[PDB]
Amino acid sequence: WEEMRDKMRKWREENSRNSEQIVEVGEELINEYASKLGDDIWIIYEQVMIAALDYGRDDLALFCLQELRRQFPGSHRVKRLTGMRFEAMERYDDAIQLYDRILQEDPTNTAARKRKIAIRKAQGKNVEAIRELNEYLE
Amino acid sequence: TRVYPSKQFDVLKDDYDYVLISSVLFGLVFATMITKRLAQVKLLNRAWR
Amino acid sequence: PPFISEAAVRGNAAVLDYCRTSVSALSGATAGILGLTGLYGFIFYLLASVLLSLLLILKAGRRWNKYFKSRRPLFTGGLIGGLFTYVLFWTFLYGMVHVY
Amino acid sequence: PELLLDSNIRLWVVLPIVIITFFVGMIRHYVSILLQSDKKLTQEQVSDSQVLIRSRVLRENGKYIPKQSFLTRKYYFNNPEDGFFKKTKRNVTNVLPMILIGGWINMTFSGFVTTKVPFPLTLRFKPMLQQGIELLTLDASWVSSASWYFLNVFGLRSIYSLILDTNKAFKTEWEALELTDHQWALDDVEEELMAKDLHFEGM
Amino acid sequence: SLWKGLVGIGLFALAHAAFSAAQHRSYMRLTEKEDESLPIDIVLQTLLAFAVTCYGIVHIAGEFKDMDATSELKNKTFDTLRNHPSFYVFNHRGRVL
């Protein structure tokens, strides 16, 4: 039965975004088996949230995010997940303030830049994204 | 009577404190459980900083 | 071969050490059981170590060079770290069976 | 094996010290985990290291790509005053809690004998393996506890595994990269490939 | 996972041998013979326990692996390689559903 766990791990390892099976198996394994699993569920939440964003639901997002919040209060990764939530519902400047903040309190943090760029690209603009990405690669 | 030319080298000490030694092993076992569950957590938290 | 993973390497080394540092202790306990002293004990270690190598060769069918480039680690392996452990189990069982 | 010893010795002085040392060798690992720190030093140094590693791999396996490209980057790195290396200018813990405990023991479990080692030892080493005894007649195989402790220490090392400057560096890279051959090394793969056959039998 | 049981059987038998030999030793020191060797049976028992245990521990010790990288690339395609998870964007068809 534990095969479900290993399949989720597989899809985590070799990035295989399809976000149809993932959400199913997640919501199955997000249940009581959680307490059985033991200190490993958190990754499964970080993985189900994104696939859910991909499926359109947005209802499971806040449940997973608030579990993450309550466990890891002063995190940075969950902040990135809130930025993701924002930019899916098209709050861009809010997300930019967020990412610039958690870069402002941690300059040597990459994910914020790599989400600023995803935002810049989702607007439609490319030519400035490229030079931003090169200034990063610099 | 009995005599002991060389101080009874093969009997334990006739003075042994059996309570200290049973108050030590449990100290270590609980310290070990402690510092097992207390490093897993700090490390996990290092991950999700 | 030209291109090496360098992770499977350490895995193989580990699954060697996990056999070796166990069998060492085991032979030590065996010797302490059928009590034999001085020289002969050391001989047993060598003999056991040799037998161990052979089994590995029989588990790595056909010498296959895709796992290892050279069979030296199977014979030499980790052989000093096996010694102290053999000594200890020898001593433990001797002091636990024949003296007491 | 000529003596007869109290079994209470086995019970209450032998197993305690094949246990204590094991749990202390575990605790040492866990506490070392809890101790180590980690700096956030600087963006500058991390970037510099990254580029130095790019240089390393260039010198190592920069022979699977077009020659002109290798030479182009080599020029971007070596070219006088444009080259990147020509513009930028700037035990005890182990041993001691093991040696402090032997002392405690030999102060505590002193006035008696513990066990026998089945290989004959040398005689001069007697006065420090027994340390309580006033026989000066025994063979030295009959030891005190401290020796058992140290033996355990050395014997359980291998059984935890089973259960668990800037500018000068830049210039040295530059100097070691000046002397370098492209050696494209791909110039017969075609024939070699179409030499025996194509190999695939897993469909 | 029968090899685990095999190893546990080897261990149990070996311990039985050790117990038998300790009590035999006591017999010896009690009858003050101190001349004779051990009975064969104990010896055979312990030796077979040793051999069997090694043959089982070799199996349960783990499994070897190739040291040629491309072995694990035989089964792989662009779809895995291309995703780049740290550059995701969701303004696409799926948001319809």
What is d(CA D69, CA A53) in angstroms, rounded to the nearest whole number? 42
Instruction: Find the CB nearest E57 among C14, C22, C93.
Output: C22
User: Is A110 buried (19+), middle (13-18) or exposed (0-12) by CB count in 10 A?
Assistant: exposed
Other CB atoms within 10 Å distance of the CB of residue D56? 13
Question: In Å, what resolution does this model reach?
Answer: 3.4
What is the dihedral angle through the alpha carbons of E8, E14, E15, E18, rounded to the nearest 10 degrees?
-170
What is d(CA E5, CA E18) in angstroms, rounded to the nearest whole number? 20
Say how many Å lie between the first and final Cα of chain B, rounded: 74
Other CB atoms within 10 Å distance of the CB of residue D139? 11
CA angle C10, C14, C17 (to 5 degrees): 140
Give per-residue burial for D100-126: e unless 16+ CB within 10 Å, then b. Answer: ebeeebbeebebbbbbbbbeeeeeeeb
Q: Can you name the residues that pair with D115 across neighbouring β-strands?
A: D143
Distance from chain centroid for Cα A64: 11
Total residues found in chain D within this entry: 203
What is d(CA E36, CA E28) in angstroms, rounded to the nearest whole number? 8
Best of D159, D160, D163 to disrupt the C interface (most C CBs within 10 Å) is: D159
User: Is E68 buried (19+), middle (13-18) or exposed (0-12) by CB count in 10 A?
Assistant: middle
Q: Which of C12, C1, C71 is nearest to E69 (CA)?
A: C1
How far is A102 from chain E, CA to nearest CA, in Å?
A: 16
- Chains A and E physically touch (3 or more Cβ atom pairs below 8 Å): yes
What is d(CA A132, CA C68) in angstroms, rounded to the nearest whole number? 46
What is d(CA D18, CA B30) in angstroms, rounded to the nearest whole number? 18
What is d(CA A23, CA A54) in angstroms, rounded to the nearest whole number? 10
Chain D residue with minimum CA distance to E61: D162
Experimentally determined by:
cryo-EM
- Eight-class DSSP state of B39: T
| Residues D10/C96, Cβ–Cβ less than 8 Å | yes
Amino acid identity for residue A98 in this structure: L
A88 touches chain E (CB under 8 A): yes
A15 contacts E83? CB cut-off 8 A:
yes
Say which residue the tokens 């020191």 belong to. Answer: E29
Chains that touch E (3 or more CB pairs under 8 A): A, C, D
**Helix/strand/coil for C22:** helix
| Residues A68/A42, Cβ–Cβ less than 8 Å | yes
Contacts of E29 in chain D (CB under 8 A): 4
What is d(CA D60, CA C99) in angstroms, rounded to the nearest whole number? 62
Say which residue the tokens 């069998």 belong to. Answer: C23
Instruction: Find the CB nearest C99 among D18, D116, D157.
Output: D116
Amino acid identity for residue A89 in this structure: M
Q: What share of chain E is helix, strand, coil (3-state, %, to 5)?
A: 70, 0, 30
| Residues E10/E56, Cβ–Cβ less than 8 Å | yes
User: Is D6 buried (19+), middle (13-18) or exposed (0-12) by CB count in 10 A?
Assistant: middle
What contacts A19, CB < 8 A, 6 or more positions away?
Answer: A50, A51, A52, A54, A55, E94
D30 touches chain C (CB under 8 A): no
Amino acid identity for residue A21 in this structure: Q
| Residues C3/E73, Cβ–Cβ less than 8 Å | no
